[PDB]
């Protein structure tokens, strides 16, 4: 996961 | 009394429900269901262009994203109405996710692209349509710059969807420009  | 309208409310409930599901079922099982389409066979499951925004793996990010969602989305729903909040959310969610997956693939999520859109929108709409009754406080501009900057320079310790955040901001600016040609 890249978090936004 | 209540400051959060139905759309503000239902988005927070959904984010919480998904956060719980990720504890119970695991991050990956939920990502498989809710991620941006990560295969051509999945490109017609249309929910996935928006549902990435409901996923968090980090207690800190969900807290902060929901904090600014509650405050900025709440302001927008109260003053400009439910429909307006829905449209900024769907469009910012769609385009932020598009730019993010374009450059880094589909494994991402978080309400933060929508939050940056809302920041952009409330700011610019306040700046050049003062009579709209929406305004981004200076203290909040400061807080949002530090947060952005922390992300850009990897100070949080985790992987950051910088594409989605910057794309989200741009969308919210563009919509506010258009919305306030007047
Ligand atoms: C991540 C945050 C997104 C919003 C972009 C903020 C940049 C705005 C530049 O500051 C402006 O300067 C004015 C006085 O100089 C302030 O009164 C005004 O409120 C503020 O708009
Ligand atoms: Cl997160």
């Amino acid at each position: 996961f890249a978090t936004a | 009394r209540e400051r959060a309208g139905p759309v503000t409310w239902v988005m927070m409930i959904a984010c919480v429900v998904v956060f719980i599901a990720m504890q119970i079922l695991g991050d990956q099982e939920v990502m498989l269901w809710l991620a941006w389409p990560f295969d051509p066979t999945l490109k017609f499951e249309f929910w996935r262009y928006f549902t990435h925004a409901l996923m968090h793996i980090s207690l800190m990010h969900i807290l902060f994203n929901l904090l600014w969602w509650w405050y900025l989305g709440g302001a927008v729903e109260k003053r400009l109405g439910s429909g307006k909040l829905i449209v900024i959310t769907l469009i910012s969610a769609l385009l932020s996710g598009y730019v993010q997956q374009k450059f880094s693939g589909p494994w991402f999520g978080g309400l933060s692209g929508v939050v940056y859109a809302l920041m952009g929108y409330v700011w610019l709409r306040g700046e050049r349509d003062p009579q709209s009754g929406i305004y981004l406080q200076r203290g909040l501009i400061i807080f949002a710059l530090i947060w952005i900057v922390a992300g850009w320079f990897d100070l949080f310790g985790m992987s950051m969807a910088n594409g989605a955040h910057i794309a989200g901001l741009a969308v919210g600016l563009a919509m506010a420009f258009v919305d306030s040609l007047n």
Side-chain angles (χ1 to χ4, degrees), chain A, chain B residues 112 159 161 165:
Chain A
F1 214 61
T3 188
Chain B
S112 68
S159 198
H165 286 156

Side-chain angles (χ1 to χ4, degrees), chain A, chain B residues 56-58 60-62 65 99-101 103-105 107-110 112-113 116 146-166:
Chain A
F1 214 61
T3 188
Chain B
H56 299 89
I57 54 161
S58 172
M60 190 205 266
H61 277 101
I62 189 182
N65 290 346
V99 174
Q100 178 64 19
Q101 66 75 37
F103 289 122
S104 319
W107 302 117
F108 72 83
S112 68
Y116 287 124
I146 292 150
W147 209 246
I148 288 168
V149 164
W152 185 274
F153 289 97
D154 206 26
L155 301 170
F156 284 124
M158 50 221 120
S159 198
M160 292 291 113
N162 297 304
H165 286 156
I166 289 125

Side-chain angles (χ1 to χ4, degrees), chain B residues 116 119-120 123 127 135-136 138 141 144-145 148 169:
Chain B
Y116 287 124
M119 251 146 208
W123 177 62
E127 194 86 342
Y135 173 69
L136 193 59
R138 286 168 168 178
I141 298 184
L145 294 165
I148 288 168
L169 179 52

Side-chain angles (χ1 to χ4, degrees), chain B residues 105-127:
Chain B
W107 302 117
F108 72 83
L111 193 52
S112 68
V114 181
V115 164
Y116 287 124
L118 281 167
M119 251 146 208
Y121 180 97
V122 167
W123 177 62
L124 187 91
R125 183 73 188 270
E127 194 86 342

Side-chain angles (χ1 to χ4, degrees), chain B:
Chain B
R1 293 182 183 174
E2 196 35 63
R3 138 153 204 64
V7 175
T8 307
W9 176 223
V10 160
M11 172 66 54
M12 291 168 91
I13 289 164
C15 282
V16 170
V17 168
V18 164
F19 191 70
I20 285 174
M22 292 175 81
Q23 307 325 302
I24 295 168
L25 312 173
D27 288 343
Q28 271 144 356
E29 171 128 304
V30 173
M31 280 177 257
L32 294 176
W33 277 123
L34 299 187
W36 188 275
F38 48 93
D39 192 71
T41 62
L42 297 172
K43 77 174 164 286
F44 292 141
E45 296 179 352
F46 287 109
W47 75 87
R48 292 170 175 283
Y49 300 104
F50 316 97
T51 58
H52 51 82
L54 304 177
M55 284 181 303
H56 299 89
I57 54 161
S58 172
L59 187 67
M60 190 205 266
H61 277 101
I62 189 182
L63 278 190
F64 280 105
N65 290 346
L66 288 182
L67 178 59
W68 299 129
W69 164 265
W70 172 81
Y71 183 76
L72 290 179
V76 162
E77 171 167 41
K78 177 60 169 86
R79 215 82 198 203
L80 301 184
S82 295
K84 176 58 63 170
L85 180 55
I86 285 164
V87 175
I88 296 159
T89 306
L90 300 182
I91 286 165
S92 63
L94 176 62
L95 298 184
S96 59
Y98 168 79
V99 174
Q100 178 64 19
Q101 66 75 37
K102 188 168 171 157
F103 289 122
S104 319
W107 302 117
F108 72 83
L111 193 52
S112 68
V114 181
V115 164
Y116 287 124
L118 281 167
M119 251 146 208
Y121 180 97
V122 167
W123 177 62
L124 187 91
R125 183 73 188 270
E127 194 86 342
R128 76 175 49 202
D129 193 39
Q131 172 274 318
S132 60
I134 62 155
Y135 173 69
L136 193 59
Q137 271 274 321
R138 286 168 168 178
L140 255 50
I141 298 184
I142 298 300
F143 192 172
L145 294 165
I146 292 150
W147 209 246
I148 288 168
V149 164
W152 185 274
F153 289 97
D154 206 26
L155 301 170
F156 284 124
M158 50 221 120
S159 198
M160 292 291 113
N162 297 304
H165 286 156
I166 289 125
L169 179 52
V171 171
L173 299 171
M175 292 186 65
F177 190 79
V178 170
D179 278 14
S180 82
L181 283 203
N182 78 327

